[PDB]
C-alpha cells in the first residue's frame, strides 16, 4: 500500500501532462487522490509546483510567434528558457538517483530544493507579465513609451528582495536596447524609427516633431523629464534638416555616445544627471555639424 502509493507519486512528477494524470485548462493538472496521510500532504506541495509550470508555458505562447511589443517578445523567450532549464536539470537527476537506489525514496528532498530555487524568481516574473498585459489593454482602448514607464516603476516598486531584482535587472538591460538604438539613431543621425511602437516620438521644409502623449511619456511628467524631451526634439530636428541637404557636409565628425547610453541602460535607473549627460553630448555633435552645413555649403 504505502510503498506503491509513494512510488506512483514519484513516477508522476517527471510528466504531469500524462494519459491518466489529466489536465484542466484554467484547476490545473489533476490526478485522483488516494489514501495515506503522507500522500495527501505530498500531493498538496506538488499542486503548487504544477500550477506555476503549466501557467509559465501558457503565457510564453501568447508572447511568442507574434508581435504586440518588441520588448514583450524578448521578455518571454528569456523567461521560459531559464526557468525550464533549471527545473528539468534538477528534477530529471534527482528522480533518477531515487529510482537507482530503490524507487520508494524520499519525495521530501526533491521537494525542498526545487521549492527554494523557484519561489523567488517565479512569482515575481509571472505577475509582472500579466500586469504589462492589462495595462496594454487599457492603453489600446485609450504603447512603447507606456511599457518603459511601467517596468521602471516596477523596479522601484519592488525595492528589496535580492534574488528577484538582480534576475529582473538582467532581463531589463536586454529589453532596453531597442529604446537605446532608437535614441542613438534619432538624436545622433536624425532618423526616427517606429514600426508599430519603439518609443513615443512621432513626426508632426524643415518640419516639426512631437511626443505622443497617448503612448505616454518617458517618465510621464517631471521638470527634469520635460526639459530632456525638449532637448531631444531639438537635437533630432537639426540633424534631419542637415541629412536632407544631401552630400554637403553631414554626420557628426566627433565621437559617438552609444557607449555612454549603454552604460545608462546597465545602471537601470531613470536618474536626471546621467540622462542629461547623454543629451548635451548628442546636442553638441548635432550643433557643430549643423553649423558646418550652413557656413561651408
Amino acid at each position: 500500500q504505502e510503498a506503491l502509493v509513494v512510488k506512483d507519486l514519484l513516477n508522476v512528477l517527471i510528466g504531469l501532462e500524462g494519459t491518466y494524470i489529466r489536465y484542466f485548462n484554467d484547476i490545473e493538472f489533476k490526478i485522483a487522490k488516494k489514501m495515506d496521510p503522507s500522500f495527501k500532504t505530498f500531493s498538496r506541495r506538488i499542486v503548487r509546483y504544477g500550477k506555476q509550470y503549466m501557467i509559465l508555458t501558457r503565457a510564453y505562447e501568447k508572447w511568442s510567434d507574434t508581435s504586440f511589443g518588441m520588448v514583450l517578445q524578448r521578455f518571454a523567450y528569456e523567461i521560459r528558457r531559464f526557468l525550464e532549464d533549471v527545473y528539468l536539470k534538477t528534477l530529471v537527476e534527482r528522480l533518477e538517483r531515487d529510482f537507482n537506489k530503490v524507487p520508494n525514496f524520499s519525495i521530501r528532498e526533491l521537494e525542498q530544493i526545487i521549492n527554494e530555487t523557484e519561489v523567488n524568481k517565479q512569482m515575481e516574473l509571472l505577475y509582472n507579465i500579466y500586469e504589462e498585459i492589462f495595462r496594454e489593454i487599457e492603453e489600446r482602448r485609450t504603447k512603447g513609451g507606456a511599457i518603459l514607464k511601467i517596468f521602471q516603476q516596477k523596479i522601484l516598486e519592488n525595492l528589496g528582495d535580492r534574488s528577484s531584482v538582480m534576475f529582473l535587472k538582467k532581463l531589463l538591460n536586454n529589453i532596453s536596447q531597442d529604446y537605446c538604438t532608437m535614441l542613438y539613431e534619432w538624436l545622433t543621425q536624425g532618423i526616427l524609427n517606429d514600426p508599430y511602437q519603439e518609443f513615443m516620438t512621432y513626426d508632426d521644409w524643415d518640419t516639426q516633431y512631437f511626443i505622443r502623449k497617448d503612448v505616454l511619456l518617458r517618465d510621464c511628467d517631471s521638470e527634469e523629464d520635460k526639459n530632456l524631451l525638449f532637448k531631444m526634439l531639438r537635437t533630432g530636428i537639426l540633424l534631419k534638416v542637415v541629412r536632407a541637404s544631401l552630400q554637403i557636409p553631414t554626420i557628426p565628425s566627433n565621437s559617438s555616445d552609444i557607449t555612454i547610453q549603454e552604460i545608462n541602460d546597465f545602471a537601470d535607473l531613470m536618474e536626471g544627471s546621467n540622462l542629461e549627460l547623454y543629451v548635451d553630448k548628442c546636442y553638441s555633435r548635432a550643433n557643430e555639424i549643423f553649423l558646418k552645413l550652413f557656413f561651408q555649403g
Binding site: 496521510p37 521530501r108 519592488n158 525595492l159
Partner: protein, 230 residues
Amino acid sequence: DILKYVSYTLLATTSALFPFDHEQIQIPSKIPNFESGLLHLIFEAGLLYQSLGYKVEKFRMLNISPMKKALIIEISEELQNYTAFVNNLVSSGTVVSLKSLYREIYENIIRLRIYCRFTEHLEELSGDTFLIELNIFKSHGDLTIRKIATNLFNSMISLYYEYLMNWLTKGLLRATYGEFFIAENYHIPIEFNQERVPAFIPKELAYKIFMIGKSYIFLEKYCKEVQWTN
C-alpha cells in the same frame, strides 16, 4: 506511523492526528504514556517552526522596507536547513525514537526561539528602527544570539550605505518607509531625525551628515552642478 505525523508537523503542515491548541498536545490516555511525553516535547519544537514560517510568508508581499526584506530573505534561507534535516531523519531513521528525534534537532530550537522575539518587534515599527531592536538584542549574552543578530545586520547595513551614498552624492534620498533620517517640514524644507539612528552611528555624527547633505542640495538649487570628483 507515529514518526510520520511528527514529521508533517516539523515540515510546517498541520497534522489531523495531534490536536493543535497553541503550544502542545492535549492527547488523552489511550496511547503509551512514555511515547505521549516524548510527543509533548516534539510538538513545542514543531509549533515554533510553523509559527515562524507563517510570519515570514505573510510579511513577504513586497513594497516594504528593504531592511525588512533583507531579514525575511535571511530567515527563509535559515529555515531551509530545517527542512533538509527532517528529510535525513526520515530516510535513515524510519523507526526512530522520539526522545532521540528531539535531541538530534536540538540546535534549531535554540535558533527559532530567538527569531520569534524579533518578528514580534518587527510589527511595531518600520525601517531604521530594526537596527535599534537589533542593537539591544546583541547586548544580551550567549555566543549564538549575537551571531544571529550580526548576520541580519550585515544585510541591513549594506542598504544604509547605499542610501547614504545617494543622499550625499546627488542630494535628496527620502526615507519613504524609513531608510534614512530625512523628515518632511520648491520651498518645503527637510529636517533631521535623531531618533532613528542606532548607537552605532552617533546622533551627532548623523547630524553632520544631514548638514553636509543639506549644503549639496543648496548647491544644485543655485544652478545644477555636474557630478564632480566627489
